[PDB]
Enzyme design. Structure first.
Site, PDB file in Angstrom:
ATOM      1  N   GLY A   1      84.626  73.009 124.583  1.00  0.00           N
ATOM      2  CA  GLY A   1      85.989  73.204 125.057  1.00  0.00           C
ATOM      3  C   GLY A   1      86.462  72.157 126.046  1.00  0.00           C
ATOM      4  CB  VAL A   2      89.269  70.908 127.339  1.00  0.00           C
ATOM      5  CG1 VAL A   2      88.921  69.969 126.198  1.00  0.00           C
ATOM      6  CG2 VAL A   2      90.366  71.872 126.908  1.00  0.00           C
ATOM      7  CB  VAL A   3      87.789  72.715 132.516  1.00  0.00           C
ATOM      8  CG1 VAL A   3      88.092  73.687 133.651  1.00  0.00           C
ATOM      9  CG2 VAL A   3      86.406  72.979 131.945  1.00  0.00           C
TER      10      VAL A   3
ATOM     11  CG  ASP B   1      73.591  69.726 130.185  1.00  0.00           C
ATOM     12  OD1 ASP B   1      72.906  68.705 130.272  1.00  0.00           O
ATOM     13  OD2 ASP B   1      74.757  69.734 129.781  1.00  0.00           O
TER      14      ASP B   1
HETATM   15  C1  LIG Z   1      88.411  69.736 139.915  1.00  0.00           C
HETATM   16  O1  LIG Z   1      87.718  69.676 138.669  1.00  0.00           O
HETATM   17  C2  LIG Z   1      87.095  70.812 138.232  1.00  0.00           C
HETATM   18  C3  LIG Z   1      86.634  70.725 136.912  1.00  0.00           C
HETATM   19  C4  LIG Z   1      85.963  71.768 136.349  1.00  0.00           C
HETATM   20  C5  LIG Z   1      85.796  73.001 137.040  1.00  0.00           C
HETATM   21  C6  LIG Z   1      85.098  74.140 136.529  1.00  0.00           C
HETATM   22  C7  LIG Z   1      84.401  74.133 135.204  1.00  0.00           C
HETATM   23  C8  LIG Z   1      84.377  75.268 134.403  1.00  0.00           C
HETATM   24  C9  LIG Z   1      83.671  75.280 133.214  1.00  0.00           C
HETATM   25  C10 LIG Z   1      83.000  74.142 132.764  1.00  0.00           C
HETATM   26  C11 LIG Z   1      82.298  74.259 131.455  1.00  0.00           C
HETATM   27  O2  LIG Z   1      82.567  73.330 130.586  1.00  0.00           O
HETATM   28  O3  LIG Z   1      81.625  75.231 131.185  1.00  0.00           O
HETATM   29  C12 LIG Z   1      82.960  73.008 133.585  1.00  0.00           C
HETATM   30  C13 LIG Z   1      82.281  71.705 133.200  1.00  0.00           C
HETATM   31  C14 LIG Z   1      83.267  70.624 132.801  1.00  0.00           C
HETATM   32  C15 LIG Z   1      82.623  69.324 133.239  1.00  0.00           C
HETATM   33  C16 LIG Z   1      81.928  69.660 134.487  1.00  0.00           C
HETATM   34  C17 LIG Z   1      81.392  71.070 134.282  1.00  0.00           C
HETATM   35  C18 LIG Z   1      83.620  73.046 134.818  1.00  0.00           C
HETATM   36  C19 LIG Z   1      85.017  75.270 137.316  1.00  0.00           C
HETATM   37  C20 LIG Z   1      85.595  75.277 138.590  1.00  0.00           C
HETATM   38  N1  LIG Z   1      86.186  74.231 139.134  1.00  0.00           N
HETATM   39  C21 LIG Z   1      86.305  73.095 138.368  1.00  0.00           C
HETATM   40  C22 LIG Z   1      86.966  71.983 138.936  1.00  0.00           C
END
Ligand SMILES: COc1ccc2c(-c3ccc(C(=O)O)c(C4CCCC4)c3)ccnc2c1
Length: 281
Positions: free
Chosen positions: A19-21, A144
Site C-alpha cells: 500500500g501507501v501511507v 523487516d
Molecule cells: C511523516 O511520515 C510518516 C510516514 C509514515 C507513518 C506511518 C506508517 C504507517 C504504516 C506503514 C506501513 O507501510 O505499514 C508505514 C511504513 C511506510 C514507510 C515507513 C514505514 C508507516 C505511521 C505513523 N506516522 C507516519 C509518518
C-alpha cells in the site's frame, strides 16, 4: 484531497512493503493521523498466481494483512506505532489502517552520506531495544527491521513501523524454514538451501545489527548490486569497519556480536540491553 468518512486524505507521507501511507486529517478531533491505504485484490496478486494442483504458496494470501491488523491491535508501546482504527467494508476492495502520526518520518534511508553520530545512534538504538524486547515478549517477530522502517516523532524518539511481514509465534520462538526481508538485512542462516530451520528472534537481532552499522556508517556492512554476490558476502565475508568515521571499540564489539554469523552464539536482546556501549553516555 479526498474525503473518507471523518478523514481528509492529503499527501503521500510513506510507502512500505504494501500500500501507501497518506497524511489524514480527522475532522472529529482536529488531529492529523497517518492512513495506510490498501487494495485487497492487489494484495492477493502480490503473493503470485496460484499453481495448478500437482516454499509452498499460502492458500489464502489475504490472511497476512488480517494477521498484521491483529498484531498491531495487541501492541501498545511508546517505541511502536499505534494503530487507532481500521476501516473495512466487506463489499469494498479497499482497506484503511489509521495510525497515530509520527511527525518526522523515517530516521534514515540507506545509503546516506549523513550518518548519525555515535551518541545519536545510541539514543535511537536504546529506543529500538525497548521496542523489540516488547515485540518479542508479545511473541511477535518483525522481520523487516531497517532504518527506513524506524520513524522519528516530535519527541525525538523512534517508533518501529511497517508490520506488513510481521509474524506472531506460539511458544518460545518462531521456527522458520524460510523467511522474508530486505536482502541486505537478512541473516546468513536464512540464505542457504539447507535441511535446518532457524530462530525468528535471532533474525531480528541480525537486522538490528545491520541497522546499528547503518546508523553510524550510512551503509550496510555487506553490500553488492549482484544479488548472488550480496548473499555470498552475508554468508562468507568477515565484518569490517571503515577507517573513518572512527567509532568506539565497545560499539565495534556490540556490532560484531550482533553480526555473529552463527545464530547459536549471536548475542540476544537481554544481553544487548546490558552491553557497555548501550549503558554508558
Ligand atoms: C511523516 O511520515 C510518516 C510516514 C509514515 C507513518 C506511518 C506508517 C504507517 C504504516 C506503514 C506501513 O507501510 O505499514 C508505514 C511504513 C511506510 C514507510 C515507513 C514505514 C508507516 C505511521 C505513523 N506516522 C507516519 C509518518
Amino acid at each position: 484531497s479526498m474525503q473518507l468518512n471523518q478523514y481528509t486524505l492529503k499527501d503521500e507521507i510513506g510507502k512500505g512493503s504494501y500500500g501507501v501511507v497518506k497524511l489524514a486529517y480527522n475532522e472529529n478531533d482536529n488531529t492529523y493521523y497517518a492512513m495506510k491505504v490498501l487494495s485487497k485484490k492487489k494484495l492477493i496478486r502480490q503473493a503470485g498466481f496460484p499453481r495448478r494442483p500437482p516454499c509452498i504458496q499460502p492458500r489464502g494470501p489475504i490472511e497476512q494483512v488480517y494477521q498484521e491488523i491483529a498484531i498491531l491491535k495487541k501492541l501498545d508501546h511508546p517505541n511502536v506505532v499505534k494503530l487507532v482504527e481500521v476501516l473495512d467494508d466487506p463489499n469494498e476492495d479497499h482497506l484503511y489502517m489509521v495510525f497515530e502520526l509520527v511527525n518526522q518520518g523515517p530516521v534514515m534511508e540507506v545509503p546516506t552520506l549523513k550518518p548519525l553520530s555515535e551518541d545519536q545512534a545510541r539514543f535511537y538504538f536504546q529506543d529500538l531495544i525497548k521496542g523489540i524486547e516488547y515485540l518479542h515478549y508479545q511473541k511477535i517477530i518483525h522481520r523487516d527491521i531497517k532504518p527506513s522502517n524506524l520513524l522519528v516523532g516530535e519527541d525525538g524518539h523512534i517508533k518501529i513501523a511497517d508490520f506488513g511481514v510481521s509474524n506472531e509465534f506460539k511458544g518460545s520462538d518462531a521456527l522458520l524454514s524460510n523467511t522474508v526481508g530486505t536482502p541486505a538485512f537478512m541473516a546468513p542462516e536464512s540464505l542457504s538451501e539447507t535441511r535446518k530451520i532457524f530462530s525468528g528472534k535471532a533474525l531480528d537481532v541480525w537486522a538490528m545489527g545491520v541497522t546499528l552499522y547503518c546508523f553510524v556508517f550510512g551503509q550496510c556492512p555487506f553490500m553488492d548490486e549482484r544479488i548472488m554476490c550480496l548473499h555470498s558476502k552475508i554468508k562468507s565475508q568477515a565484518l569490517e569497519f571503515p577507517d573513518q568515521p572512527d567509532i568506539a571499540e565497545d560499539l565495534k564489539d556490540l556490532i560484531t556480536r550482533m553480526l555473529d554469523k552463527n545464530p547459536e552464539s549471536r548475542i540476544v536482546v537481554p544481553e544487548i540491553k546490558l552491553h557497555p556501549w548501550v549503558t554508558r553516555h
